[PDB]
Every structure is written in C-alpha cells, then in structure tokens.
C-alpha cells in the first residue's frame, strides 16, 4: 500500500535536508576566525540604577532614541524611564498584574504589554487630555502571551503559548495573519531590521523563520536540547542567536540554513533568559540564571567579560540602537545601565 | 543647581510618581494572595460560589482582611513556563473531588481521575518554587461519596485498601494517601478540610489557615521558627 510510502516520505525529506545541509559545510567559523585578533577583556561599569519597581521585572525594551526605556513588573505597572537623568516619565497601571512582555513603538507614541490574561493591551502615550489610555485590547490567543514586537504604528506581531504567532491590525483589532507550525509553547520573538521576516523560538527545541506578508514558514532550525527562551537577529539580518535552558547559545545562518557556532562553558549549568547583540555584531550579551550576564565574542567563542551586580535572576537585556549602553533587568526589582 | 526649570519640574513629577507607587506598594503588600488549583472541574465552582479568558481573580474580604484568589483553569500550556510568577503566594488551595474514584478521565480512557489528581498534587507540592508554601487541600462532594460508596468499593481505585467499606475510614485513607506525597514535611504543612458544607465554614477554614501561615512566617522573620 501507499500508506507506508506517505509515512516514510517525511523521513526521506528530512534525510535529504540533512544531507544537503551537511554537504553545504566545508570549513567551520572557528577555523576561519582563529587568525583574527581577540576582542580582549571587556569591562563595563554600572552607570545608572533605576529604582521604583517592587516585584520581579519580567521585560524591558529600549526606545529608538536610545534614551527612553519601558519596564514591566508583577506589581501591574509599566514605567517609562529617562535613562539619562534617572527620571520617571509615566507610570501606567495595568488591568492584569501578570505581565511577561512589553514593547515600545519605533515612533514612540505607543507601549504594548501582555501576559497571563491572553490580551495584548496597546497604550497611547501622546494624548490631548494628558494621561495614558488604552487604545484597544487585542484578544484571540488561547494561551499566555509571551512576546510582542511593533512593526509600525498600525501592526504588531504577538507570540503566545498556544503554539501560534499572530499578526494584528490595531485599527480594527483583528488578526491579519496566523502563523502555525510550532509544537510547544512559543517563548521569544525577534524582528528583522527591514521588517519583512521574523524568527521565533519555541519549547520544542526549534526555531522557525517566517514571512510577514505571506504567512509561510521558510526555514526551520534545530540543534538545541531544551526550551529556547531568547532569540535575537544579527545587525545585518542574515543571522540570529538563540538562548536555551541547556546553558548554551547557538548561532544560525539563514543563507546556509545551518548552525555556525555554539557558545557554552563547563562552569555554566544554568539556563539563559535573554540574548542580545552589539551594534557591530561582535559582542553577544547573554543573561543567565546564575545572577549575572556574560559577554561573549560572537566570532571567537570566548568570554570577553562578566556583568555582575544583580542579586536575583537576570530576566531581560537590551542594547541601544546607537550601541552606547546595555540595560539589564533582574528579579530583584532593579534596572542597571552599563558602559 | 545646574538644572533648568523644566528639568526641576520633571524631577518633581518623578517624585510624585514615586509617592504614588509607594502608596500602591504598601496598599498591595497587606493583601493575602491565594492560588487555586484543581483537576478539571472538581470543586472550583462550588468553592467560588461559597464565597459570595485566562487567569481569573476573585476579591473578597473577611474580618478586615482582603484576599486575592487566582484561578489558572483553562490554561492549556506548559506549567513550568508560568508557575514561577506565583512564588510569593501566601498559600495554595487545592480542590479534589471525592466522588471520582469510580470515574474515567473522559478524554483518556482506562484512566482514574483520582490518580491524575494525585500526580498534580505531587507535582505542585514538590516544586522548586513552592518549597515553603503551605497547601490547603479541599475534598469536595462528601455526600456523593457517602451515597456512592455503598455499592462501589474503594478497592478499584486503590487495590491495596484493606479497610472497612464505609465513609470515615475511606476518607481517612484518602487523606493519608494525599498527605504522604509531601516530601518536604520539615518546611510546610497541609491543611485538609471536608468542604461539602452549606454553611459558611470554608471561608473560616481559609482564614485560620492563613493566620497560621502568617504566624509561622513572622516567627521565621524573628528567628523563633
């Protein structure tokens, strides 16, 4: 019967993909990189300490002006900070105090948040009556909303725990495109610089590359052994890095459809909560569960420095657009700025 | 002091915001937070109505004490990805139906509901985030259990049962079997109540359990516990 053939066709296609990927590799990145100068010892000092949150900080996001922050904690308040002067611009109470993610629009007019309430709330920062209101509430996910990223002032992509990413339209509050294919809960989400593709990490130890305007998965990336919790594009948009719970960061190339380099150490036995890059892409910053953040040489696979100073688990990382500073937020209700 | 008028006004705004957050912080720091769990629909609706699309919160006050009860039903997701948000809860309320040992898991055949409830209790009580969080266990529908035990022996659910086929010993055996799953007996307690009561006794039981938990926490703070 043809049922056996239709069952084995998936395995045959997987084997063909694996063989094509293996035949496409000739020289590792370490072999090409061992003949370039090391970065050195990168030392950063805490320059600002933003205080005012009273519970675990779960997410942060930088503004496009590299000055305004947004932070979310379990108290149920979103705080917009002025990083230069350590000042609070706004304090927005939330209907649901269980928030996991926050976002800052590129135009700076909107802030989004969501969590266990299955709802992404959009907040209008610039109102004529002088207070931050709710533009609308986006409903339609059957699981907790884990990540949200703004594409423009009218579109926002949301990552949820229902094994599905969705693209929304804030003018009508509807779901323009639905992305399916993941098996487990989808945890992280990062957008391409040109805002045409985005990668998505899930709990099935896999990452996928999507097309925004077509709703079609293009590539799938394997290699991890546990849940992926963070993901971030390279500045040129041709690579991305993933952090998982097996105490290891990977680097993947979209054009080669392969893993280039792994980042791990024997002393590291704790999971990874956040992954971020530098402006040039040479330095990769990873927040860990053992109370500190490590700085990695993205080309030499070497530890360039350690960002210690947090008394609890580092849960969120962020690098400014101009690359001037990096902001770490932990579960000790503190935000630190580094240079 | 090297500051403009607008900068000083922004500083004053920041100070007012700090004051508002401080007020909200000590407003919310005196509210008891409880987390409610239960396998399927065991006693969730009964325990909610006795106190009259994702997480559901319920507000009620009892003897100058406000309560925050969170329900995590219909959250078909991995528990380990959001269970660390409830580290600071005062107590965990667990609802188990007594009249389900004769029932099948409906969605899955050849499976007992009591065993699923026991596995959920074992997962919750032995978690890394709830080492020192006390558990209030509610056993619902004792009348249905009492009127159903006269024809269906408990041996089908528990083959090792060697007791009388009546209400008191069977209920004691079930309570003991739920309590034996606690592997952290030196750091937390389990409060068990039979909660098929028309009168307003479940709220009182919750109040006494929370008072005991608060006394133990205060004694740990002062070094006497």
């Amino acid at each position, epitope marked *: 019967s043809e049922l056996d053939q239709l069952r084995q066709e998936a395995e045959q296609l997987k084997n063909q993909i694996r063989d094509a990927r293996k035949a496409c590799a000739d020289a590792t990145l370490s072999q090409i990189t061992n003949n370039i100068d090391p970065v050195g010892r990168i030392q950063m000092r805490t320059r600002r300490t933003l205080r005012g949150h009273l519970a675990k900080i779960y997410a942060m996001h930088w503004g496009t002006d590299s000055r305004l922050l947004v932070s979310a904690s379990q108290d149920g308040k979103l705080i917009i900070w002025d990083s230069y002067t350590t000042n609070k611009v706004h304090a927005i109470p939330l209907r649901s105090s269980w928030v996991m993610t926050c976002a800052y629009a590129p135009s700076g007019n909107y802030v989004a948040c969501g969590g266990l309430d299955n709802i992404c709330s959009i907040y209008n920062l610039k109102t004529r*009556e*002088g207070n931050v209101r709710v533009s609308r509430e986006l409903a339609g996910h059957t699981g907790y909303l884990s990540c949200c990223r703004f594409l423009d002032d009218n579109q926002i992509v949301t990552s949820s725990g229902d094994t599905t990413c969705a693209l929304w339209d804030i003018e009508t509050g509807q779901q323009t495109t639905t992305f399916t294919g993941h098996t487990g809960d989808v945890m992280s989400l990062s957008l391409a610089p040109d805002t045409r593709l985005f990668v998505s990490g899930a709990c099935d130890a896999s990452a996928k590359l999507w097309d925004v305007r077509e709703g079609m998965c293009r590539q799938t990336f394997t290699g991890h052994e546990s849940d992926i919790n963070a993901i971030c594009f390279f500045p040129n948009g041709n690579a991305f890095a993933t952090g998982s719970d097996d105490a290891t960061c990977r680097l993947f190339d979209l054009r080669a459809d392969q893993e280039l380099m792994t980042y791990s150490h024997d002393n590291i036995i704790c999971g990874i909560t956040s992954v971020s890059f530098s402006k040039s892409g040479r330095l990769l910053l990873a927040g860990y569960d053992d109370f500190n953040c490590n700085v990695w040489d993205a080309l030499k696979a070497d530890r360039a420095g350690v960002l210690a100073g947090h008394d609890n688990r580092v849960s969120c990382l962020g690098v400014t657009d101009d690359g001037m500073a990096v902001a770490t937020g932990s579960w000790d209700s503190f935000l630190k700025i580094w240079n | 002091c090297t500051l403009s008028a*607008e900068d000083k*006004a922004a500083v004053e705004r920041s100070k007012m915001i700090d004051r508002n957050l401080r007020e909200d912080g000590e407003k919310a720091a005196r509210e008891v937070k409880l987390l409610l769990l239960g396998a399927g629909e065991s006693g969730k609706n009964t325990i909610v109505k006795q106190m009259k699309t994702g997480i559901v919160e319920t507000h009620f006050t009892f003897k100058d004490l406000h309560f925050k009860m969170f329900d995590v039903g219909a959250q078909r997701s991995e528990r380990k990805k959001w269970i660390h948000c409830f580290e600071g809860v005062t107590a965990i309320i667990f609802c188990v139906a007594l009249s389900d040992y004769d029932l099948v898991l409906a969605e899955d055949e050849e499976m007992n509901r009591m065993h699923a409830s026991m596995k959920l209790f074992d997962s919750i009580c032995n978690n890394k985030w709830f080492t020192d969080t006390s558990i209030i266990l509610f056993l619902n529908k004792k009348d249905l259990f009492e009127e159903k035990i006269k024809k269906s022996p408990l041996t089908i659910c528990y083959p090792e049962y060697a007791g009388s086929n009546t209400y008191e010993e069977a209920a004691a055996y079930i309570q003991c079997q739920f309590e034996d799953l606690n592997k952290r007996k030196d750091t937390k307690e389990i409060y068990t109540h039979f909660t098929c009561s028309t009168d307003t006794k479940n709220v009182q039981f919750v109040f006494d359990a929370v008072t005991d938990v608060i006394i133990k926490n205060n004694l740990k703070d002062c070094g006497l516990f």
Partner: single-chain antibody
Amino acid sequence: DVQLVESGGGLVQPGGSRKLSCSASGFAFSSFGMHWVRQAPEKGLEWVAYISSGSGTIYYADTVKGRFTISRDDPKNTLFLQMTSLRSEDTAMYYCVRSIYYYGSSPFDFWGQGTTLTVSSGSDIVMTQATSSVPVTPGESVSISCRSSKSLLHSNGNTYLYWFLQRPGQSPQLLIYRMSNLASGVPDRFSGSGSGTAFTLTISRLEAEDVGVYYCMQHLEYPLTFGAGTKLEL
C-alpha cells in the same frame, strides 16, 4: 473637548479685592501645572503666577508678590487667583494657561478664553522683537526675528524658546515650543531656527489665517519674559 473657562471680571475700585476662577473640563487637571498670564490694552503679554502639580512649587512675578495669591482645587477642577491691593496697572485681560513638564513635553499648549478686569481711575531676561508691524501678501514667505540678552542654550542641549500667535479677538496658541518643534495641529509651513541669542520663525506660503501678532517667550528661568510682539497686516 479641552476647555478652560475664566470668570470673575468686571469693574473694581482701586485698593479692593477680587477672586478669579478658572474652571477646567476635558483633561486630567491634577497632572498639569497652571499659569496666569495677563494682557493689558497696550497689546503686551505679561506673566503673573504659576502653580505646579501637587501644589509643591508656586512662583510669582515681581509686580504681584505679596498681594496676589494663586491656588488650585483638584477635586473641583478649578484654579483660583486671589488679588488684593488692586492698582490701575492691573487693568488687563487674564488668561488661564495649561502646562505639563516631562521629557519631550509641550507646555503652554492650551489657553483659556480670558476674563476682562477693569480698575477705575535687573536680572530678568530681556527679549526684544525689532519689527513691530510688517506688511505681507498672501502666498509669500516671511521671517520674524527675536533676540535675547542671555543665551538660552542650556548645558543639556535644549534651547528654551517658545513661539505664540494671537489672532485678532482670540486667544494665543503655541506654534514652536523649543526653537524647532511644531506643536500639535500646527501646519508644517511654520519653521523654527536659530542658536544662542538669535532666533527666526519662518512662515512659508502665508495665508489670511496667519494674520495676527507673534510673541517669543523664554522658559529658561523664572520669571518668564515675553516680547513686544510683531504684528502681521494685509
């Protein structure tokens, strides 16, 4: 529907007392600082008093200290001004100005209708507009220049200079709030430029809707000082 209605005017004998009331309806009154500005019939704008959010900072002009009192009632959304020892120089039309201060804010954004009050019988920054009346034809550009005795460029890179337009028989409105930034609703044809002590407002493709008087105000240090005013005609 932002509104600021002032009442309590009329004719007052010299040496008397009068309370001015400013009622707000359409915005969060508690989060905005409030200003009082009066305009004498000599066609000039003069700053009077300021009260902050939370009533933690109150400022007065040198000509009203010890005899004018400003207070706000945030439950009732009403702003008060208690005026004592009235002189003949206090005969003016008083405006209620709304201001908010954070990073990237737009203070002096809304002005009230105004009330008319009639009385019978050194270190301050000086800002001067040389042109007091210039003719203009619709469909042509125009530039208005304002200068200051002290440089308004602070160490933080902000140049605190504001531009206002008052049409005949109307209330002033904000055009540029820090030397380059257009306010909400202002057409793009208005531009701000300058640095230090020289400033210029450019109005390309002027229409009959832009005919009025233009003012330059500094917000570097209290008291806030306006200009004489450049009047556009024809």
